[PDB]
Every structure is written in structure tokens, then in C-alpha cells.
Write a protein that binds this ligand. Structure first.
Ligand SMILES: [Zn+2]
Ligand SMILES: [Zn+2]
Ligand SMILES: [Zn+2]
Ligand SMILES: [Zn+2]
Lengths: 200, 200, 200, 200
DNA sequence: TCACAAGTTAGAGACAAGCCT
DNA sequence: AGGCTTGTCTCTAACTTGTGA
């Protein structure tokens, strides 16, 4: 089904200079998660760990939160809620925390919350923002994507964006960034292909 | 049956500098939607996505709406209401929102409204106007045309115009633009043919 | 919709030596009705006169009737009732005698009856059998076919057979014959094409 | 889930000399249904017409029925009930007669019955046996397969057999035959590949 | 990773079949 | 009846994208 609205995807570094960072990987055919700076696009395998770094120029207040939400990238599909396909929603691979219909999970965080928006029908996953750990310069969140982009009855080969928002305790916007995502069996192969096709 | 009047088709950019834009496609025999600047004519396949861009020089007020209506292009046919043919009206391919007789649908918009004008008998489809992200420069609406121009008992090979009007909440005119439409099996082939014939 | 059964099409000359005959026409591109002995197939234009000759070796009893019924030729379509398309059913071209949904009409016979079979849902048209007018060797019935084979939502390019049955006053079978029919804009052209393709 | 038993697949021509026949098709990459005598295997596209001929040496009694049932061909999978995948079960493409979970449908038969066996949990589809006329030599049933062999969460790339049984009015066995089935996007390509691999 | 399985898209070309000067 | 309009089919080939020894 459809949402009545479309979440904004405009980059907004905001008062805290909020930026995203990604690990440097290359393109071994079967690498588990790899980011293309050229495409601003993450290529990852289903259910595998996807590190996303949060960088700020100055620390936001205690109670700040970090939300992730997927939307379809193509305008004609933007109003359709991104969710898991009928098969994966039924295979019971929940980690005890995530509802079965949610595409994006956060792993390794007991304070994770999953939201099914009463008004927009959009799914999202939120964790408290924690400043960087000793001497590290950034905060890392580990996401999992629970369907392939290709999943019939779900994303069905349509590209998505992940929107990461920094919010205050009330849900007010503090910052926003986004990246494209392809969940696929062969992230290395597929990243290479799409990068090659930039010239075509 | 016939309407008592004919909707105006005169271009009117109005106070907000309202213009239309179209995606740049070429003419692969079986492309789904392609626009000819030379003919100001959209060539599209039945039920396929047809993106139309709304450009304004300045943002209209909240509550502004965008209406689409088809009329026959030829003067002798202008008073005839454009509607779906008897076969397609009966094939039940409604998206739950559009009445079966309406030629033009909007896809991916929960706030769509379909009007069967009590006085003029004309069909139209309207959605709220939404300003672009302050990143994008225009707003895109996705239309679907639900019969071929050739449909016997419907358009019956007669060309139509789509009239796009920008209206206030009361239905008062703020701006108007229009383009010719051919719904056909082979948009690319047909666009090429008609453009070639410009010289003939 | 579908019938629960399929009418038999087996030739049965029966006790009266019942055979069909057709006029000798050739293949002028736009001839109105032409019969191919090679294909046992009539090619005719929509609503035009199609003469069919009834030949018998001996005269059946007074009260004998002649029924015509169409069925789809292809096995997968045989259970589907042959009827007019949605457009032609609605165009009101009835001769005051034929129901609008019936494909086959008889012209020039005040004693024609149209049957919509309560059990099989099949349409048919029946007239009283009349022996040949003094000196002629056969009885001619003039049929009209009220859709093209190509009509979308009706025959939809599927070939049909016309089954002609000689019946007693109770509807018991006395004899049966059949021929394929194509209703088309250009019977002469199309007959020639199908005959040429016999070698291919 | 699993059945407690496995339907027999042993060929049994029985008292009436029950045999199957198939149409002669070749291997155009995108043909809709093609049978390989070498593999005794039908290759067909999802939801497309699959003609199966029933041949008998003598006519079974009125009330005889013809049942079709799918089972997995591989022994380790044989106890698993063959059914549609979660996606296709939910896409609502029912013809008003078939339950959404059934893989095999019969098209064009108003007397079709769909059985969900209370004890074995197996799905099957059955129609009354109808003799040919004394013109045709066989009776044809038109099946549709409503998932690809590859469907994730359903057949999941596992080959199936279709078992066709001739039964009396009580369900007692009169005859049995079977053939392998692959439902796939490119029956011609795939048939050619598997036939070539017979030598490998 | 490679080799292969198996679905989807885009051409092109050849036709199919209505229209009307 | 020619010539053209306009929908449909085959076709092949490239490509997409998952699987597994
Ligand atoms: Zn999935
Ligand atoms: Zn139509
Ligand atoms: Zn018709
Ligand atoms: Zn399926």
C-alpha cells in the first residue's frame, strides 16, 4: 500500500555538521558490504552487516536519536512503502526485536526501536545517538537489510534510498543524509558493473 | 454523448509562471513514454507511466490543485466527451481509486480525486499541488492513459489533447498548459513517423 | 463466460442427405462474401449478406428447422460462448428482430427466432426449413455476421466455426454440417493469403 | 508443510488403455508450452495454456473423472505438498474458480473442482471426463501452472511431476500417467539446454 | 570467484488486419 | 484496390541477477 506523503531526502548537515562515512572496501565478487563513492550507493548482501558511520563537527545533546528509513528512489514509486516481500516476511528470522515486515534492522543495539508510523505507514528503525568511543572520530551503526532489491512482491528490482536522520528527543529534525542501496547476491560484481556503466 | 461546452486550451502561464516539462526519451520502437518537442506531443503505451513535470517561477498557495482533462483535438469532435471504450470500461483494471470510464488516471497519489462534471459531463483527475523539494526544480505527476487512441468505440483513432490546469482551492484558474497525446502500441515508431511527415 | 458443454461439429448428412453449398466468388480485395473450398472457410465483411445453400436428397417433413450456431475452433476456446464484442453489442444496429448480443443474424426472414439457451448459454438463430422454390435445387439462407473476427473483447482474432443443423420440430438432430468463418474488412485479400499459406 | 504419504506415480493404462499425448512444438526461445518426448517433460510459461491429450482404447463410463496433482520429483522432497509461493498466492489472479494456493488450474471448464485433501493435504484439480466426438481421437484438457519452478518460497527450483489419474465417480483408480514439468520464462531455451545435457 | 541458472528488456522485422481516396 | 495505419508475434541477444562445489 501507499503512504500519503514522501519523506524529504534533502541533505542537511545542520547545526552539528552531520555527515555519513563508509568503510573502504573494493569489489571481490562476493564481498558482504561495499560502498561506491562515485554512485553514493551501498551494495550489500541480505542480512549481512552494513556499517554506516555518523560524523559530526560537534556533539548533539543527550537524547538525540538516529533514524533510518527506506524509500523507493524512482518518483513513480516514491509513495509506496518499502517493506519485506511476502516470503521473507513469513520466514521467521526475527532477532526478537525487529518486526518481520521491516526491511532495515539495527544489529547489536539493545535500545533499538522499530516504528510503524500511524499516519504515513512508513517503517523506520531508531537508536539513541552515542558520541564516539574513546579517541574514535565517528559513531558506527550496523544495519542489516532483510530482502534483496530483486525480491518478487517486495522491492521487485526497484532501487531504494536509505535516509538517515539525526533527531532530537521529540523527533524534530537536526540533520539528514542519504545513500542509495542495492541488496544483492554479488555486491562486488554489481558495484563494478554499475560504475562501468557510468560511462555508457 | 456530448458536452454543452468546450474547455479552453489557451496556454496561460499566469502569475506563477506555470510551464510543463517532459523527460528526454528517444524512439526505441517499444519505449513506454516519449515526448516530441517538435510536435508538443506525448506518445505512450496504454496504462504505462507518463511523467509530466510542473514548473513554476514562484510557489502557488497551499491548497492549489492540478487538474488533467482530455479533449478531442479536431474541431468537429471537440464537444464529444473523451472516455474509455466499451471494452476497457468493462475489463476491471481499476486501481481501486479511478472510475472505470475515466481515460486519464494519476498513479501513486492517495489524495487523487476523480470528477465527473455534473454540468459539462467532462471527466478529470485532480491532485493537490506539492512544491518541489528545495533540491528538485519541479514537481512530477505520473499519469496513465487507459485506452489506445485507436480503441474502437472510444477515441477511435482521433487525436486528443491533455489540458493541465493549475487551480486554487475553489477551482479558479491560475494557469494552463496542454499537449497532444497518442496512446499506441509503438510510441517510438509512431513518433518517428509523425516527425518525418512534418516535411511531407 | 463459459458454457458447460461444447456443441458437436461432426458432419452428419443424415436420412435426408443434408449438404451445404456456397456461391462461387473469387478474391477481389473488397468482395463482401467469398467461400474457400480448399479451407472450407467463408470470408465475409461485417453485416454483409452471406448466402448459405441447403441441399437435401429428399425433402424433410414440414416443421423441420435450420439452426446456426458459432463456436470457437481452437480447443482451448471451445467452451467460451461466441458473442458480439462490448462495442458492437452497444451500437444499436438491431434489425428489430435480433438481440444485440447475437453474432449471427438471418436477414429477410420474418419467421426467424433467436435463442439464448438456458442451460448451455449458447446463442443460436433458427428459421423454418422451406423446400426449394419451384425449379431451384436448393434452399438459400442469408446470414449476417455482426462482428469482425478481430473485435477486441469479442472474438479477439480467434477463428470460429458455424454449425448448421437440420432439426425436427422438437429440436432433435436430423443433419449437421459446418464451415469455418473469418469476418474481416478484406475477405478477398485474406482468403488469398490463407490459401497461399497452405503450402507454407 | 508435509503430507503423511506420497501419491503413486506408476504408469497404469488400465482397462481403458489410458495414455497421454502432447502437441508437437519445437523450441523458439519464447514458446509458451513445449513437450520433450526425450525427457517426458513439459516446459511451459506461468499461467499459459498447456494442452494435455487424453487417449483411451475404449470409452470409460459416464461419471469418470480426470484428476491432476503435482508432486516433487526428488525423493527427499516428495512428502512436501506442492503449492504456490507466498507472493503468487497473494497476488489476486484467481479466475473465480481456483483457490489462490493451488499450483495447477484447468482453464475453460465450468465443471472444474479443486480439492484440498483433508487427510493428505495434497491439492488437486479434477474435471469430468468427456469422450472425443467420433471425429477427434482424443480429449484435450487445458492446464495452467501458476508459479515458475524457480519461485522462491514455493517450488524453489525443484522439479515436479504432474500425475494425471482417470478415476470413477467414487475416486477409485482407473488409470494413471505422469510427466515432468518445468514452469519457466523461456521453455524453448530450457528444453534445448536439458536435451543437450542428456549427452553430458 | 567462476560458471551457470533462470528472469527481463530491447531491438527488429514481419506480419495482421482495419481504413479510405 | 493501393497504400497506409496501427496492433501483434517471433526472435534473438544482451543483459540481469541468484546459486553453489
Ligand atoms: Zn524478500
Ligand atoms: Zn479502449
Ligand atoms: Zn465487434
Ligand atoms: Zn510463485
Amino acid at each position: 500500500p501507499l503512504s500519503s506523503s514522501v519523506p524529504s531526502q534533502k541533505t542537511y548537515q545542520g547545526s552539528y555538521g552531520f555527515r555519513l562515512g563508509f568503510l573502504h572496501s573494493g569489489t571481490a565478487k562476493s564481498v558482504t558490504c561495499t560502498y561506491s563513492p562515485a554512485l553514493n550507493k551501498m551494495f550489500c548482501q541480505l542480512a549481512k552487516t552494513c556499517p554506516v558511520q555518523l560524523w559530526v563537527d560537534s556533539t548533539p545533546p543527550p537524547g538525540t536519536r538516529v533514524r533510518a528509513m527506506a524509500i523507493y528512489k524512482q518518483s513513480q514509486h516514491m509513495t509506496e512503502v518499502v517493506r519485506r516481500c511476502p516470503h521473507h516476511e513469513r520466514c521467521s528470522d526475527s532477532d526478537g526485536l525487529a518486526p518481520p515486515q521491516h526491511l532495515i534492522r539495527v544489529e547489536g543495539n539493545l535500545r533499538v526501536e522499530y516504528l510503524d508510523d500511524r499516519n504515513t505507514f512508513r517503517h523506520s528503525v531508531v537508536v539513541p545517538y552515542e558520541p564516539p568511543e574513546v579517541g574514535s572520530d565517528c559513531t558506527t551503526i550496523h544495519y542489516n537489510y532483510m530482502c534483496n532489491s530483486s525480491c518478487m512482491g517486495g522491492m521487485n528490482r526497484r532501487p531504494i534510498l536509505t535516509i538517515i536522520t539525526l533527531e532530537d528527543s521529540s523527533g524534530n529534525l537536526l540533520g539528514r543524509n542519504s545513500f542509495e542501496v542495492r541488496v544483492c547476491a554479488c555486491p562486488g560484481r554489481d558495484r563494478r558493473t554499475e560504475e562501468e556503466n557510468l560511462r555508457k
